[PDB]
Amino acid sequence: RLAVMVLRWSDGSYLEDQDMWRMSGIFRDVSLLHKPTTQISDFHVATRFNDDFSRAVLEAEVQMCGELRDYLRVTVSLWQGETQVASGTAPFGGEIIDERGGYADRVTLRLNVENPKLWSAEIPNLYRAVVELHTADGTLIEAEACDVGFREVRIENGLLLLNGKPLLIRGVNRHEHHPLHGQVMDEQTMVQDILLMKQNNFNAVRCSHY
Amino acid sequence: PNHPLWYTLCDRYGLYVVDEANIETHGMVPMNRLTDDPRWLPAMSERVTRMVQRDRNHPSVIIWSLGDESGHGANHDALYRWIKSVDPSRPVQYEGGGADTTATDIICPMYARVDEDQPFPAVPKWSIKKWLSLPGETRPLILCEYAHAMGNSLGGFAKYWQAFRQYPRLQGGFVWDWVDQSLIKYDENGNPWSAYGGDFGDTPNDRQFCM
Ligand SMILES: [Mg+2]
Ligand code: NA
Ligand code: NA
Q: How far is A158 from chain B (nearest CA, A)?
A: 5
The DSSP-derived string for A142-181 is: EEEEEEE-B--EEEETTEEEETTEE----EEE----BTTT
The span from the CA of B21 to the CA of B52, in Å, is 9
* Breaks in chain B after residues (C–N exceeding 2.5 Å): none
The span from the CA of B94 to the CA of A186, in Å, is 63
Q: Is there a contact between A180 and A168 (Cβ–Cβ < 8 Å)?
A: no
Task: With H, G, I as helix, E, B as strand and everything else as coil, classify residue A78.
Answer: strand
Is B20 annotated in the active site?
no
The long-range contacts involving A16-23, CB below 8 angstroms and separated by at least 24 positions, are A18/A208, A18/A209, A18/A210, A20/A175, A20/A177, A21/A177, A21/A182, A21/A183, A23/A182, A23/A183
Sign of CA dihedral B164, B170, B172, B177: negative
The span from the CA of A132 to the CA of A75, in Å, is 5
Decide the pairing of beta strands B92-93 and B61-65: parallel
Query: Exposed (0-12), middle (13-18) or buried (19+): which is B77, by Cβ within 10 Å?
Result: middle
Q: Is there a contact between B71 and B30 (Cβ–Cβ < 8 Å)?
A: yes
The span from the CA of B117 to the CA of B140, in Å, is 18
Query: Exposed (0-12), middle (13-18) or buried (19+): which is B25, by Cβ within 10 Å?
Result: buried
Known binding-site residues of B equal 24, 26, 69, 145-148, 205, 209
Residues with Cβ < 8 Å from A107, sequence gap 6 or more?
A61, A62, A74, A90, A91, A92, A93, A94
Interface test with B, best of A157, A160, A165 (most B CBs within 10 A): A157
The span from the CA of A184 to the CA of A181, in Å, is 6
Angle between helices B41-55 and B74-86 (to 10 degrees): 30
Task: Residue B140: give the domain boundaries.
Answer: 1-211
Q: Is A52 annotated as a binding residue?
A: no
Q: Is there a contact between A40 and A75 (Cβ–Cβ < 8 Å)?
A: no
Which H helix or E strand runs over A43?
strand A39-49
B136 touches chain A (CB under 8 A): yes
Which H helix or E strand runs over A96?
strand A96-98
Q: For residues A145-176, b (16+ Cβ closer than 10 Å) or e, as one string? A: eeebbbbbeeeeeeeeebbeeeeeeeeeeeeb
Q: How many CB pairs under 8 A join A and B?
A: 5
Q: Is there a contact between B61 and B17 (Cβ–Cβ < 8 Å)?
A: yes
The span from the CA of B46 to the CA of B81, in Å, is 15
Which is nearest to A154 in space by CA: A143, A165, A146, A144?
A165
Residues with Cβ < 8 Å from B59, sequence gap 6 or more?
B11
Known binding-site residues of B for Na(+) equal 209
Find chain B residues with C-beta within 8 A of A159's C-beta.
Answer: 135
Which is nearest to A7 in space by CA: A26, A20, A21?
A26
C-alpha A203 – ligand 1 centre gap (Å): 24
- Phi, psi angle pair for A201, to nearest 5°: 80, 20
Q: Is there a contact between A108 and A60 (Cβ–Cβ < 8 Å)?
A: yes
Find chain A residues with C-beta within 8 A of B135's C-beta.
Answer: 157-159
| Number of separate domains in chain B | 1
C-alpha B72 – ligand 3 centre gap (Å): 21
- Triad A105, A106, A107: Cα angle to 5°: 135
Q: How was this structure determined?
A: X-ray
Q: Is there a contact between B135 and A159 (Cβ–Cβ < 8 Å)?
A: yes
Q: How many CB atoms lie within 10 A of CB A139?
A: 9
- In angstroms, the Cα distances linking B149 to A16, A101, B97, B153 are 60, 76, 24, 5
Residues with Cβ < 8 Å from B207, sequence gap 6 or more?
B196, B197, B198
Per residue, the 3-state secondary structure of chain B, as one string, reads CCCCHHHHHHHHHCCCEEEECCCECCCCCCCCCCCCCCCCHHHHHHHHHHHHHHHCCCCCEEEEECCECCCCCHHHHHHHHHHHHHCCCCCEECCHHHCCCCCCCCECCECCCCCCCECCCCCCECCHHHHCCCCCCCCCEEEEEECCCCCCCCCCHHHHHHHHHHCCCEEEEEECCCCCCCEEEECCCCCEEEECCCCCCCCCCCHHHHC
A157 touches chain B (CB under 8 A): yes
Task: Return the DSSP state at A182.
Answer: B
Q: Is there a contact between B160 and B173 (Cβ–Cβ < 8 Å)?
A: yes
Is B145 annotated in the active site?
yes
- Phi, psi angle pair for B209, to nearest 5°: -70, -10
Which H helix or E strand runs over A191?
helix A187-199
Half-sphere exposure of A147 (CA within 13 A, CB side): 5
Resolution limit in angstroms? Answer: 2.8
Which H helix or E strand runs over A192?
helix A187-199
The residue from B20, B69, B95, B137 that is catalytic is B69
The span from the CA of B160 to the CA of B114, in Å, is 6
The span from the CA of B62 to the CA of B87, in Å, is 11
CATH of the domain at B100: 3.20.20.80
Which is nearest to A127 in space by CA: A170, A186, A76?
A76
Q: Is there a contact between B211 and B182 (Cβ–Cβ < 8 Å)?
A: yes
